[PDB]
């Protein structure tokens, strides 16, 4: 009985990157911002001292 | 007349070890002042703290207590070039030590003097324990700072 829309994900239609500069650095940005949020905080490493 | 003869400055005396590799490192949240700064260097290695979070270092928190002793950076002293390279008249507290009496002859005087050190090899070990050791006077009144 299941079913589940198809999240659809075709490629940047827009070439946001040709003359638009302005806008691709706040992509990056954000894009970046958020791989920080998983980027695993390390462990146990030589006591700085 | 001093600044006709040595010149001036346009800068501050780094008076407080704020500049120091120790200081920037705890920079922690926590600031200890100069007076910490300079008790903490004195400190053994394996004591030297660092409990908040987180180097021979040991020479610019003793220069920064120093100069704080001697308001090098208020009263009228903040006008002068204290390395102009007029005040040759000399041959680090024996410098300054130098210097400062160089200095106030010249105010008390209007003529020059030039000092000599012959410190023996001996007599420095002893004053050099001496410097690990000073202790201040608060009378903030004093306070001449002005620009």
């Known amino acids: 009985t299941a079913r589940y829309i198809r999240p659809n994900l075709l490629q940047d239609r827009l070439n946001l990157h040709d003359n638009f ?29 | 007349y001093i600044i006709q003869c040595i010149g001036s400055r346009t800068y501050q005396i780094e008076d407080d070890g ?40 040991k020479y610019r928190i003793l220069e ?18 204290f390395n102009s390279p007029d005040l040759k008249l000399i041959r680090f507290i024996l410098h300054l030590y130098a210097k400062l009496e160089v200095i106030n002859y010249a105010i008390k005087n209007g003529s020059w003097i030039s000092l000599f050190c012959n410190y ?19 009378s903030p009144y004093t306070n001449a700072n002005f620009f």
């Not at chain 1, 806008?23 to 949020?37: E, G, H, M, Q, V």
Request: charge should be neutral; proline fraction near 3%; include cysteine.
């Open chain 2, 64 to 81: 920064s207590y120093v100069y704080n002793l001697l308001s090098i950076n208020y009263g009228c002293y903040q006008l002068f070039d």
């Open chain 2, 120 to 138: 023996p090899k001996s007599e420095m070990i002893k004053l050099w324990k001496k410097m690990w050791n000073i202790t201040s006077l608060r």
């Open chain 2, 18 to 57: 704020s500049k120091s590799a120790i200081s920037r490192l705890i920079s922690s949240v926590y600031k200890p002042s100069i007076e910490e700064l300079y008790k903490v260097i004195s400190l053994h290695e394996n004591e030297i703290y660092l409990s908040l979070g987180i180097y021979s270092d």
């Open chain 1, 21 to 49: 500069e302005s806008l691709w650095d706040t992509i990056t940005t954000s894009n970046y911002i958020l791989a920080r949020s998983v980027v695993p905080d390390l462990k146990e490493l030589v006591s700085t001292e």
